[PDB]
């Protein structure tokens, strides 16, 4: 590599220059040496998906441009790490992390197979948000690219929902230096998982205190209204796909659903809980496998909590919380199977083109 001219990642145009810059950054102590095999693997999977996509412009120079942008932001994280606040807002200046995330995901998102279900219900959600009400999406979660899938799929009909959604996320989404730059382009509430609090017990305390501040920040934000929240009540990404047979998204933790229900209930504005289905695991099945694949999202009917839980006695909180989470999970699971059908078959999509639409087309 001694003959290769290179400066910074922002100047990189070819795969060869990319790894030469990466080599330099490692030698200068800016990034750890393990990033070379990681980016070698990542570059190879991503190159394959993009060049095989058949999309106009999806050539070697596009791949070097995207990979260099990822690398440049990773280097920035190590040299000047960002501490996520409890209520983190979309960073757009002086570096636009939103568009950074959108450009990445859009090279992998096969728009011709993708759908967004129930635009009329997204219109209702937009109406509830414009009236100052609060809306929570109880979602399955499949890839770290899901905020990009969400916004790209909704951009064309519902731009305010696509940009202003707030993701409840924590742990390596806001602590891993290689995931942070994507996360920095989204609105987040930083909520660290109960289970993973003792990975390094000196790190537990910075997480518990953050968690108290996020609870306070959410109470305040929700009492001002107009907040659209996304949360994955299973607590992480869906488990791997089944070799054969039926597959359903991971179960919803009743404690997480109850957390959202109670936050919405004690707020001054009206609150709404919607089950929300996302089909995105083909893009990046959980090292980063990447594929050019179809995706979709669809929002099920708003949950009527009193109708769902009222057969259980008000004292029996465990049962009422299990009823809400299970109703939420079952709606998501049923809509996910429709999504999986319409994205794997052009004829199934056309047959249901009244509900599962392609506003971009």
Using CA atoms, how far residue 81 sits from 24, 117, 184, 196, 313, in Å, is 20, 38, 11, 22, 49
Return the closest-CA partner of residue 276 out of 242, 304, 249.
Answer: 249
Locate 184 and state its tokens.
């920095």
Q: What angle do CA 135, 283, 8 make, to 5 degrees?
A: 100
Domains, the chain, in order of start with CATH, read: 9-81 (1.10.1200), 98-357 (3.40.1130.10)
Question: Can you give the length of the chain in residues?
Answer: 361
- CB atoms under 10 Å from CB of 219, counted, come to 12
SS (H, E, C) the chain: CCCCCCCCHHHCCCHHHHHHHHHHHHHCCCCCCCHHHHHHHHHHHHHHHHHHHCCCCCCHHHHHHHHHHHHHHHHHHHHCCCCCCCEECCCCCCCCHHHHHHHHHHCCECHHHCEEECHHHHHHHHHHHHCCCEEEEEECCCCCCHHHHHHHHHCCCCHHHHHHCEEEECCHHHHCCCCHHHHCCCEEEECCCCCCCCCCHHHHHHHHHHHHHHHHHHHHHHHHCCCEEEECCCCCCCCCCCCCCCCCCCCCCHHHHHHHHHHHHCCCCCEEEEEEEEECCCCCCCCCCCCCECCEEEECCCCCHHHHHCCCCCCCHHHHHHHHHHHHHHHHHHHHHHHHHHHHCHHHHHHCCCCEECCCC
Four-residue CA torsion sign, 170, 173, 174, 177: positive
CA gap 84, 245 in Å, rounded = 41
How determined?
X-ray
What tokens appear for 197 in the block?
Answer: 């609090």
Please write down the HEC assignment for all residues of 46-103: HHHHHHHHCCCCCCHHHHHHHHHHHHHHHHHHHHCCCCCCCEECCCCCCCCHHHHHHH
Strand-pair partners of 356: 117
Residue 228: closest CA among 269, 178, 191, 256? 269
Cα–Cα distance measured from residue 63 to residue 106, given in angstroms and rounded to the nearest whole number? 12
Question: 343, 296 in Cβ contact below 8 A?
Answer: yes
Q: Which phi and psi (to 5°) does residue 359 adopt?
A: -55, -30
Question: Which residue has 């929902």 as its token pair?
Answer: 161
CB burial of 19-56 (b: ≥16 within 10 Å; e: otherwise) equals: bbbbebbbeeeebeeebeeebeebbeebbebbeebebe
d(CA 345, CA 339): 10
Tell me the Ramachandran region of residue 316: left when phi exceeds 0, alpha when psi lies from -120 to 50, beta otherwise. beta
Question: How far does Cα 76 stand from its chain's mean position?
Answer: 22
On the question of a cis peptide bond just before residue 289, with omega within 30 degrees of 0, the verdict is no
Query: What angle in degrees, to the nearest 10, is found between the helix axes of 254-265 and 317-344?
Result: 100
Query: Residue 239 and residue 250: Cα distance in Å, rounded?
Result: 7
In the structure encoding, which two tokens stand for residue 315, read together?
């004292």
Nearest one of 141, 165, 130, 162 to 269, comparing CA atoms = 130
Phi, psi of 173, deg, nearest 5: -60, -30
Task: In whole angstroms, give the CA distance from residue 158 to residue 151.
Answer: 9
- What are the Cα distances from residue 359, in Å, to 108, 126, 151, 152, 164? 18, 16, 13, 11, 19
Instruction: For residues 4 and 17, give the distance between their C-alpha atoms in angstroms, rounded to a whole number.
Output: 7
Contact, 280 vs 166, CB < 8 A?
no
Largest CA distance in the chain: 76
- Taking the C-alpha atoms of residue 105 and residue 185, their distance in angstroms, rounded to an integer, is 13
**Angle (CA) 163 340 271, round 5°:** 40
**Contact (CB, 8 A) for 36 and 22:** yes
Starting from the edge strand earliest in sequence, which strands make up the sheet with 296-299, in order? Answer: 87-88, 187-190, 166-169, 228-231, 134-139, 271-279, 296-299, 115-117, 356-357
In angstroms, rounded to a whole number, what is the distance separating the alpha carbons of residues 78 and 5?
A: 24
How far CA 15 is from CA of 4, 112, 150, in Å, comes to: 11, 28, 30
> Residue 234 has which token pair?
């299973």
d(CA 238, CA 347): 27
């Amino acid at each position: 590599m001694a003959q290769v001219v290179r400066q910074k990642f922002k100047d990189v145009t070819t795969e060869q220059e990319f790894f030469a810059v990466l080599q330099d950054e490692i030698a200068q102590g800016h990034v750890p040496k393990l990033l070379m095999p990681a980016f070698q693997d990542f570059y190879n999977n991503y190159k394959t998906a993009v060049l095989g996509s058949g999309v106009p412009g999806a050539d070697e120079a596009l791949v070097a441009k995207i990979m260099s942008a990822i690398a440049d932001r990773s280097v920035h994280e190590f040299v000047e790490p960002y501490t996520f606040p409890s209520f983190h807002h979309r960073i757009l200046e002086p570096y636009n992390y939103y568009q950074f995330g959108q450009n990445y995901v859009r090279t992998l998102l096969d728009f011709s197979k993708s759908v967004v279900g129930h635009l009329a219900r997204f219109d209702e959600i937009e109406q509830q948000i414009a009236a100052g009400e609060n809306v929570v999406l109880l979602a399955n979660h499949q890839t770290e690219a899901d905020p990009g899938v969400f916004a790209l799929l909704l951009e064309h009909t519902h731009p305010r929902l696509a940009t202003d959604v707030i993701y409840v996320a924590g742990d390596r989404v806001v602590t891993d230096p290689l995931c942070k730059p994507f996360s920095m382009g989204r609105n987040l509430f930083c909520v660290h998982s109960k289970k993973r609090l003792d990975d390094i017990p000196e790190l537990k305390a910075s997480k518990v205190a953050t968690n108290r501040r996020t609870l306070s920040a959410m109470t305040k934000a929700l009492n001002e209204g107009g907040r659209l929240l996304w949360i994955a009540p299973s607590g992480g990404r869906d488990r791997p796909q089944a070799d054969t047979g039926a597959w359903h998204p991971d179960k919803f933790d009743p404690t997480a659903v109850e957390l959202m229900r109670q936050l919405l209930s004690r707020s001054a504005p009206k609150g709404h809980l919607y089950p929300f289905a996302m089909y995105s695991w083909e893009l990046m099945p959980p090292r980063r496998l990447t594929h050019f694949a179809g995706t979709g999202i669809s929002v099920c009917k708003e949950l009527d909590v009193d109708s769902i839980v009222s057969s259980a006695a008000v004292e029996d909180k465990a049962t009422r919380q299990q009823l809400l989470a299970t109703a939420a999970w079952q709606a998501v699971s049923d809509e996910y199977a429709i999504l999986e059908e319409v994205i794997g078959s052009e004829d199934a999509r056309r047959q249901r083109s009244d509900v599962y639409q392609q506003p971009w087309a």
